[PDB]
Amino acid sequence: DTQVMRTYHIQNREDYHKYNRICGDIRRLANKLSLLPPTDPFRRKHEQLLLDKLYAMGVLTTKSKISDLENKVTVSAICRRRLPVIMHRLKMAETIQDAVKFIEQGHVRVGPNLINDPAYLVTRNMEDYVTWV
Amino acid sequence: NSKIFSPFRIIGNVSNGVPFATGTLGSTFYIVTCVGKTFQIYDANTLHLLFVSEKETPSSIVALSAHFHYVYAAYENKVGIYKRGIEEHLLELETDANVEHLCIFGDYLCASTDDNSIFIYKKSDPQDKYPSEFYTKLTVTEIQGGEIVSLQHLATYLNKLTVVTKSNVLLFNVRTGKLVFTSNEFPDQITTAEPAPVLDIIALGTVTGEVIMFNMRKGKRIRTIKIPQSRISSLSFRTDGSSHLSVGTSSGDLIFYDLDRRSRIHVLKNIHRESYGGVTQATFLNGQPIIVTSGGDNSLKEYVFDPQPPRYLRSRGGHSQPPSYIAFADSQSHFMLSASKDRSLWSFSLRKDAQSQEMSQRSKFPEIVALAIENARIGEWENIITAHKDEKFARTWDMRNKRVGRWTFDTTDDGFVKSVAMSQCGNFGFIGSSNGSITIYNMQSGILRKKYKLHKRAVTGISLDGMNRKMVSCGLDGIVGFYDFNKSTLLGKLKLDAPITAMVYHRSSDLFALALDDLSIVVIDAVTQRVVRQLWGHSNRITAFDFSPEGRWIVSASLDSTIRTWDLPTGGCIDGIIVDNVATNVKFSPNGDLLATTHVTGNGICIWTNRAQFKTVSTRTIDESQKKLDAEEQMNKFHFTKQLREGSQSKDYSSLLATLINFSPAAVDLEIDEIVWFIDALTQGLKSNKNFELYETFMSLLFKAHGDVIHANNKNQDIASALQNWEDVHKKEDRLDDLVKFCMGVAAFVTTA
Amino acid sequence: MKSDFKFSNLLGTVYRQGNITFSDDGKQLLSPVGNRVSVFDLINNKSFTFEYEHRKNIAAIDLNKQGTLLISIDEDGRAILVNFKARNVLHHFNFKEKCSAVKFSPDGRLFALASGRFLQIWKTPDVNKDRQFAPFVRHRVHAGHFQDITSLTWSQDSRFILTTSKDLSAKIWSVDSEEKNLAATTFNGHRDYVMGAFFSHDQEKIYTVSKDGAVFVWEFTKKYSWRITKKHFFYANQAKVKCVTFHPATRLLAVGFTSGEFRLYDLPDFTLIQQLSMGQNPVNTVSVNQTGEWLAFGSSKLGQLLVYEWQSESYILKQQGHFDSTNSLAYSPDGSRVVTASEDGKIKVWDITSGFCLATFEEHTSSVTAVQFAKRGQVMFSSSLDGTVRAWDLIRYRNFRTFTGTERIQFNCLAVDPSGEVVCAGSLDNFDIHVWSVQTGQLLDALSGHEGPVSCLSFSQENSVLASASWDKTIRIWSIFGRSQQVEPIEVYSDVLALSMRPDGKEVAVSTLKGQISIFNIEDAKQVGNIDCRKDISKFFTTIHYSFDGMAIVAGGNNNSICLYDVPNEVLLKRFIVSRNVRVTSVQFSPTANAFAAASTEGLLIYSTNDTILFDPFDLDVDVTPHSTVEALREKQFLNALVMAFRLNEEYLINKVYEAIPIKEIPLVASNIPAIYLPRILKFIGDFAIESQHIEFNLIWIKALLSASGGYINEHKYLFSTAMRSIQRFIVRVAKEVVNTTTDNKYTYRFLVST
RNA sequence: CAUUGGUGAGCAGCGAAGGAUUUGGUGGAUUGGGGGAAUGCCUUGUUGA
């Protein structure tokens, strides 16, 4: 539990509860949409669109099967969509700590806008445009 | 009496030299200080202006003394009893002699006169609010004692009254009127008396530096202290256990003194102006290491013994001498910039606090003769430009940090700086020297930039239009200059009739006003290099003037004690105000609300309120020495019977058409014979050349509602005669449509082509 | 232009919380926003008083007995006084604590404020001039209570104060130290929390209401004292009575709910008259007119930003919208209607000259990014984040087409030709630009030319040139209607987001990636780069617009500021928004040359060129009297009255010198006017026309002038463009009146001939 | 050869009987998802007093 709270420089303790509720909604959506006859194109089409939008959200960066929806969607996946982890893994800063130290005091820029929030999220297609000021 | 400006308030006032007094509001304290014919009530701990009195006295305030809520002030023979700055009661001495001092104890009012007579007032009930009932009148014969110094009252002396003379002490029994005690003749004249926290001791400061701890029961000295060359003005007791004493001099120097180890510890040095009389009153509060200082120099300072010397804790003050030049700093009427002749520099607020801040100059600097201000680049570098008397370099100033600039500005011709000016963008510094050179600096990097020289006497004023394109100037040689600022090209100049003493530019209307030596105000256009007006009437020297913010008015003031206002479109003087003291300077606020005057006597800055609610006036001189609503309203998306029959008799349908045009959309009322008189009413409607836009709607709604009874199944009854009466006049009104087709199509063609 | 531009309107009504009340006149609506106070008049909504000393965004508001005094209270406890036209008469920090309610007398003598655990009543100042440092005088104060005072009620005697308290109780106060009936007797027994009390206007029924729906009735028997008369117990209604107001008709009750519905009742009958639903969003407060004819109730900030006006015979008088933070604005070709784009995905039309909320369109699935009119006045194209664009015509209210066709989730910039043939949209996440013929939605081409996200697009009035600014330091120019394509330039600097076109096809304005805003022509001669965008309470360049006369541009970023510039270098004027916690996101320029717009997160537009300022155009005062010399030229020389009194500019003169000259004189006047005194009078007629009823009179003027100098305004364009638009809207809005009704008396005479 | 980085001694100039850097306290104004029962609970029916 608090392993996740300490790995990714979470400024709070509430954020693990919130992302736990969102991932719970995704799992119960997966189970309810799972229990249909598998030739019903309702199930195929809606699980397909759920796959494609979860491609775009960067959570399932891995190209996926259906059964990954039970398997990989955790809190830590969406926590790896937080800004300084994108910053570190894009090899700008040196630690996650120092990335959060830079976003606390305004040197980081996504697009044309200043950022000062350590809970802004990035897509799989907005992270091309990250620079400094 | 005035038709533009109204007397609003004075700002910048802290003290005048009258002794302040301390009051108790529950557990905290307040201070009662005099200014003139108006007093102020401050916090004792954090120094906020808590009250200003509502109404000025006829004459100057002499004695001030207070109780739990009741501030008592003195003038000619009247005692003003006020609460919260508002009068409860006016209680007058039955004489004409001037009131000197007041002592208020128990239920009595003790009123000293200048003729050595004292009046005694009483309450009715011991739970009443103030004394108002006469009790008696005592006198001081000069065979019993000299002139009355002051009035005090020592505690637990039932009905005894302490009246000290310049020689001896008279102790009275006011209920009976007796003189129960007289003291023997003292060597030196007494100027200071003060009660003690213990019984029966009263302190006496002599004319020389002698302190006398006198006892009232036995009548003998206990201790005296000699201070060489000191005129004692004030005594008080720090009763926080630390039994000390302060002794005030007339020099502004203050002796903080230890009474049992017998130690000269401290002296405050020109904390109050010896020129203004030095320390007027110094008082300890009861029970805290706090002493309050006020003098004649328009400032209160709190000195507290940090637990051992005291310390400057917090204070409020202003220019001790009356001001020389002011300016408005903001476009929101908040902070004003003020410079005087006692060489200080203060930035005041205008708002309800009356907090203010003296600038940072970091033995004072020479006084300012020419000031200029811009508020375009605040916070980044300096934006205030000041000259000085008999100097050759103009200093700069920051409005943000309240601190002095970092640049000195040279004339480069060995003259005196006679005029300063800034552009609108705040990049440039214009300086005009008394030998006639106009030099131009950067305001950012403090560097020399550019130099012009056309005038051959002292350049008395420079300005620049808001577009930074055309540069105007004026000399003592009657020459007005007109330049390009983008180039160094020499565009055009004018010869006039007199030397020019002042120049104030108005930027959003592109005019300027010049004050000549022939006592006339000339108004000159800036664009076409042309004189447009010349105004006469001030009998003496024009001193200061300013444009109103919307550029319609000019207000000048002069040594004929007149303050006149001059409407530019009519060329005529619209109002003068004839005052009793002649104001040095005047400026409009950038908002259209406030007019600022600075005077010769007194230190404050008087503020005037522009009325700006109305007027239609132009009066003069010398005196005492909808159309969518109905047409959208008709399409519905979701008695009166006397008049039409009286119109059945004659042609009275104008009142009926008035009750049609008045109110009540009558789509149900025209449905409750009579239709013929309705159509004749309508033909009287078209007969006049008005309100056709409602009338056509009446006609068409009539053909919407009753259109079957109009039709009569098979027409040409007497209905159709009234329709025939409507037809030809409706053919008369056919003309207006083709004009609309003409303008619509031709305007469409000039839109296309 | 030099004029004093200042706020005297706002963009849509209620964004924020507060009280609400009418005037005593019944024709003036008092409906604040959080930041300022917007008092409409009920017929033809306009804007009267505009205070701003509010540092905090809540109001408490009431007028005395004729509307000559208005207050407004925010959270801190300072108030501000205005009389009729926002003089800002008095100003007064009143309290270090907040206020719950403010109430006048019907007599204007006493003054009522509820705060803390006390109750303040003040002696009211009359209207005068200023000259009071502290104008308010304390009359009495009353101690005490047990906790907070939440509602307040005044009586007709001006002797009798009924006030509730937070501790489930009510109290009575005699004003003039009378001790009315020698009793200030409490009211108890209430099981639940008290939301209000009322005193009836016949002095015999004392009224209380609780939060549950309970209502308790006490009598004026003071056997001897208070007895209950009618009780209730509600357990199944299961909401909370949020607000309550009582009729001056003294027969009826009004009860507002958190559940989102509107209750009406009778006082001693307890009959259910009507209840009405409007949503689920809670009712904040409700107040009735002084005659019971009109009802108005306000809705809370997080819920509806909507205030309705329902009558007792059940029809809604004023309905409205006014939703949240705004993306985009554009002026219609008639200078009267203004589109808005909201975040929740609607498109609303605002008639901001008159305060109506006219009409809506709702087909968006998410937020709207771009709106712009076509020059025909027929159609307007909306762009979304829906992944498609669509067309709209005005009062046919019908969707023409919805262009899309490549797989896409984001569009960001929409622009059309003046020709109405082709519509282009720029994908924020494709490196390409899309066109569509409006005939079909056929795809002509896909014009591949960029290397970054394309982010701003506009056309020209020459209409052979496409201006294409992408976010890769590269400005591009395109040909669409020839038989080839083109070479596209390179910027020097600083990634651009904001592009703005001159209406000539000859000038292009760009916003560089800092405070420098720069311009260059279509032969890339860079004229000016201009200095930063100040006023922090980082720096940006978001929107920019070229004014219509061709002499000014307006810059707006996201830093509480907006700047004016001319074609040369100079900073003209910087206006700005004061409030406390982006603001600006879009700015465009009116075709009436009277004002322009700035889309803010608050929502605030107007600039309003006025004429109260003394301008001296051509040596005004050599014409020494504006009165007597003009009086000489009303008797003689009517050519010289125009040139004389026209150099003068008292608006209180132009009505009479313009009216008084005779009809036959007019073509002689217009044939002999100078060509330099022409545009200010052509602009004067175009805005004086819309007010009066002198249609024949002004129409023979515009016949004379437009008949006079047609070729001169044909060649000397771009000012009589603005004036000509201003007169053409008057021509069409009168033509569609009198042609309609003159037709409606053109059928009649031959309809008589029928049978 | 690059008045190239570190370091020290002098000179022109600027100022005069004190100058340059650094820091503490103090006052004024501003700032949860998937499964499950015994046991327990909840709901409902019942059995005897």
JSON list of C-alpha atoms in Angstrom, two decimals, chain B residues 352-445:
[
{"chain": "B", "resi": 352, "resn": "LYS", "atom": "CA", "xyz": [-9.95, 56.23, 5.64]},
{"chain": "B", "resi": 353, "resn": "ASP", "atom": "CA", "xyz": [-6.87, 55.07, 7.55]},
{"chain": "B", "resi": 354, "resn": "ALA", "atom": "CA", "xyz": [-4.81, 58.26, 7.07]},
{"chain": "B", "resi": 355, "resn": "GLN", "atom": "CA", "xyz": [-1.73, 56.09, 7.37]},
{"chain": "B", "resi": 356, "resn": "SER", "atom": "CA", "xyz": [1.17, 57.68, 5.51]},
{"chain": "B", "resi": 357, "resn": "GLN", "atom": "CA", "xyz": [4.84, 57.06, 4.87]},
{"chain": "B", "resi": 358, "resn": "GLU", "atom": "CA", "xyz": [7.80, 59.40, 4.75]},
{"chain": "B", "resi": 359, "resn": "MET", "atom": "CA", "xyz": [10.09, 58.63, 1.82]},
{"chain": "B", "resi": 360, "resn": "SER", "atom": "CA", "xyz": [13.60, 57.24, 2.10]},
{"chain": "B", "resi": 361, "resn": "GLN", "atom": "CA", "xyz": [16.41, 59.67, 1.23]},
{"chain": "B", "resi": 362, "resn": "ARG", "atom": "CA", "xyz": [19.23, 57.20, 1.63]},
{"chain": "B", "resi": 363, "resn": "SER", "atom": "CA", "xyz": [21.59, 66.90, 6.91]},
{"chain": "B", "resi": 364, "resn": "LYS", "atom": "CA", "xyz": [18.42, 66.74, 4.83]},
{"chain": "B", "resi": 365, "resn": "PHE", "atom": "CA", "xyz": [18.30, 67.42, 1.10]},
{"chain": "B", "resi": 366, "resn": "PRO", "atom": "CA", "xyz": [17.56, 70.88, -0.34]},
{"chain": "B", "resi": 367, "resn": "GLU", "atom": "CA", "xyz": [13.91, 71.68, -0.96]},
{"chain": "B", "resi": 368, "resn": "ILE", "atom": "CA", "xyz": [12.15, 70.91, -4.22]},
{"chain": "B", "resi": 369, "resn": "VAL", "atom": "CA", "xyz": [11.19, 73.63, -6.69]},
{"chain": "B", "resi": 370, "resn": "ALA", "atom": "CA", "xyz": [10.11, 71.41, -9.59]},
{"chain": "B", "resi": 371, "resn": "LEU", "atom": "CA", "xyz": [8.53, 67.97, -9.52]},
{"chain": "B", "resi": 372, "resn": "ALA", "atom": "CA", "xyz": [7.36, 65.54, -12.17]},
{"chain": "B", "resi": 373, "resn": "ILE", "atom": "CA", "xyz": [5.78, 62.11, -11.88]},
{"chain": "B", "resi": 374, "resn": "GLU", "atom": "CA", "xyz": [4.72, 59.21, -14.09]},
{"chain": "B", "resi": 375, "resn": "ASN", "atom": "CA", "xyz": [3.02, 56.01, -13.10]},
{"chain": "B", "resi": 376, "resn": "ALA", "atom": "CA", "xyz": [3.62, 53.96, -16.25]},
{"chain": "B", "resi": 377, "resn": "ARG", "atom": "CA", "xyz": [6.62, 51.86, -15.20]},
{"chain": "B", "resi": 378, "resn": "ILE", "atom": "CA", "xyz": [6.15, 51.52, -11.44]},
{"chain": "B", "resi": 379, "resn": "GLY", "atom": "CA", "xyz": [8.02, 48.78, -9.64]},
{"chain": "B", "resi": 380, "resn": "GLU", "atom": "CA", "xyz": [10.80, 48.43, -12.17]},
{"chain": "B", "resi": 381, "resn": "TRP", "atom": "CA", "xyz": [12.92, 51.58, -11.95]},
{"chain": "B", "resi": 382, "resn": "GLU", "atom": "CA", "xyz": [12.60, 55.21, -10.94]},
{"chain": "B", "resi": 383, "resn": "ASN", "atom": "CA", "xyz": [9.71, 57.37, -12.10]},
{"chain": "B", "resi": 384, "resn": "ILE", "atom": "CA", "xyz": [9.82, 60.61, -10.06]},
{"chain": "B", "resi": 385, "resn": "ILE", "atom": "CA", "xyz": [12.01, 63.57, -11.05]},
{"chain": "B", "resi": 386, "resn": "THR", "atom": "CA", "xyz": [12.95, 66.35, -8.62]},
{"chain": "B", "resi": 387, "resn": "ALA", "atom": "CA", "xyz": [14.91, 69.59, -8.85]},
{"chain": "B", "resi": 388, "resn": "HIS", "atom": "CA", "xyz": [16.32, 71.59, -5.94]},
{"chain": "B", "resi": 389, "resn": "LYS", "atom": "CA", "xyz": [16.93, 75.22, -5.09]},
{"chain": "B", "resi": 390, "resn": "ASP", "atom": "CA", "xyz": [20.30, 76.53, -6.29]},
{"chain": "B", "resi": 391, "resn": "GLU", "atom": "CA", "xyz": [21.55, 73.14, -7.47]},
{"chain": "B", "resi": 392, "resn": "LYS", "atom": "CA", "xyz": [22.66, 71.91, -10.87]},
{"chain": "B", "resi": 393, "resn": "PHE", "atom": "CA", "xyz": [21.55, 68.27, -10.82]},
{"chain": "B", "resi": 394, "resn": "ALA", "atom": "CA", "xyz": [18.11, 66.71, -10.72]},
{"chain": "B", "resi": 395, "resn": "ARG", "atom": "CA", "xyz": [17.61, 63.56, -8.69]},
{"chain": "B", "resi": 396, "resn": "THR", "atom": "CA", "xyz": [15.32, 60.64, -9.39]},
{"chain": "B", "resi": 397, "resn": "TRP", "atom": "CA", "xyz": [13.01, 58.65, -7.11]},
{"chain": "B", "resi": 398, "resn": "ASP", "atom": "CA", "xyz": [11.16, 55.32, -6.98]},
{"chain": "B", "resi": 399, "resn": "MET", "atom": "CA", "xyz": [7.45, 55.31, -6.30]},
{"chain": "B", "resi": 400, "resn": "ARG", "atom": "CA", "xyz": [7.51, 51.60, -5.45]},
{"chain": "B", "resi": 401, "resn": "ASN", "atom": "CA", "xyz": [10.22, 51.19, -2.83]},
{"chain": "B", "resi": 402, "resn": "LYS", "atom": "CA", "xyz": [9.61, 54.66, -1.26]},
{"chain": "B", "resi": 403, "resn": "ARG", "atom": "CA", "xyz": [13.36, 55.09, -1.58]},
{"chain": "B", "resi": 404, "resn": "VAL", "atom": "CA", "xyz": [15.55, 57.57, -3.40]},
{"chain": "B", "resi": 405, "resn": "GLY", "atom": "CA", "xyz": [16.79, 57.08, -6.94]},
{"chain": "B", "resi": 406, "resn": "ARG", "atom": "CA", "xyz": [20.23, 56.28, -8.24]},
{"chain": "B", "resi": 407, "resn": "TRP", "atom": "CA", "xyz": [20.75, 59.03, -10.81]},
{"chain": "B", "resi": 408, "resn": "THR", "atom": "CA", "xyz": [21.82, 62.67, -10.76]},
{"chain": "B", "resi": 409, "resn": "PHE", "atom": "CA", "xyz": [20.93, 64.79, -13.77]},
{"chain": "B", "resi": 410, "resn": "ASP", "atom": "CA", "xyz": [23.23, 67.45, -15.17]},
{"chain": "B", "resi": 411, "resn": "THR", "atom": "CA", "xyz": [22.29, 70.66, -16.96]},
{"chain": "B", "resi": 412, "resn": "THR", "atom": "CA", "xyz": [25.60, 70.66, -18.92]},
{"chain": "B", "resi": 413, "resn": "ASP", "atom": "CA", "xyz": [25.54, 74.47, -19.11]},
{"chain": "B", "resi": 414, "resn": "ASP", "atom": "CA", "xyz": [26.25, 75.50, -15.47]},
{"chain": "B", "resi": 415, "resn": "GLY", "atom": "CA", "xyz": [22.77, 76.84, -14.77]},
{"chain": "B", "resi": 416, "resn": "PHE", "atom": "CA", "xyz": [20.08, 76.04, -12.30]},
{"chain": "B", "resi": 417, "resn": "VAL", "atom": "CA", "xyz": [17.42, 73.43, -13.03]},
{"chain": "B", "resi": 418, "resn": "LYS", "atom": "CA", "xyz": [14.26, 75.45, -13.59]},
{"chain": "B", "resi": 419, "resn": "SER", "atom": "CA", "xyz": [11.85, 72.88, -15.04]},
{"chain": "B", "resi": 420, "resn": "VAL", "atom": "CA", "xyz": [11.39, 69.10, -15.20]},
{"chain": "B", "resi": 421, "resn": "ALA", "atom": "CA", "xyz": [9.18, 66.88, -17.36]},
{"chain": "B", "resi": 422, "resn": "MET", "atom": "CA", "xyz": [8.61, 63.26, -18.35]},
{"chain": "B", "resi": 423, "resn": "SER", "atom": "CA", "xyz": [7.00, 61.59, -21.33]},
{"chain": "B", "resi": 424, "resn": "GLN", "atom": "CA", "xyz": [4.03, 59.28, -21.08]},
{"chain": "B", "resi": 425, "resn": "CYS", "atom": "CA", "xyz": [5.96, 56.07, -21.71]},
{"chain": "B", "resi": 426, "resn": "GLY", "atom": "CA", "xyz": [8.37, 56.94, -18.91]},
{"chain": "B", "resi": 427, "resn": "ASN", "atom": "CA", "xyz": [11.55, 56.38, -20.92]},
{"chain": "B", "resi": 428, "resn": "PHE", "atom": "CA", "xyz": [12.79, 59.95, -21.14]},
{"chain": "B", "resi": 429, "resn": "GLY", "atom": "CA", "xyz": [13.91, 62.74, -18.85]},
{"chain": "B", "resi": 430, "resn": "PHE", "atom": "CA", "xyz": [13.47, 66.35, -19.90]},
{"chain": "B", "resi": 431, "resn": "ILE", "atom": "CA", "xyz": [15.49, 68.97, -18.07]},
{"chain": "B", "resi": 432, "resn": "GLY", "atom": "CA", "xyz": [15.54, 72.71, -18.74]},
{"chain": "B", "resi": 433, "resn": "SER", "atom": "CA", "xyz": [18.30, 74.87, -17.33]},
{"chain": "B", "resi": 434, "resn": "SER", "atom": "CA", "xyz": [18.31, 78.53, -16.37]},
{"chain": "B", "resi": 435, "resn": "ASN", "atom": "CA", "xyz": [20.86, 79.26, -19.10]},
{"chain": "B", "resi": 436, "resn": "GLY", "atom": "CA", "xyz": [18.40, 77.90, -21.64]},
{"chain": "B", "resi": 437, "resn": "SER", "atom": "CA", "xyz": [19.60, 74.41, -22.41]},
{"chain": "B", "resi": 438, "resn": "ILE", "atom": "CA", "xyz": [17.12, 71.60, -22.85]},
{"chain": "B", "resi": 439, "resn": "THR", "atom": "CA", "xyz": [18.81, 68.26, -22.39]},
{"chain": "B", "resi": 440, "resn": "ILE", "atom": "CA", "xyz": [17.28, 64.81, -22.69]},
{"chain": "B", "resi": 441, "resn": "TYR", "atom": "CA", "xyz": [18.22, 61.68, -20.78]},
{"chain": "B", "resi": 442, "resn": "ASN", "atom": "CA", "xyz": [17.26, 58.04, -20.62]},
{"chain": "B", "resi": 443, "resn": "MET", "atom": "CA", "xyz": [15.27, 57.14, -17.53]},
{"chain": "B", "resi": 444, "resn": "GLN", "atom": "CA", "xyz": [16.31, 53.49, -17.70]},
{"chain": "B", "resi": 445, "resn": "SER", "atom": "CA", "xyz": [20.11, 53.56, -17.92]}
]
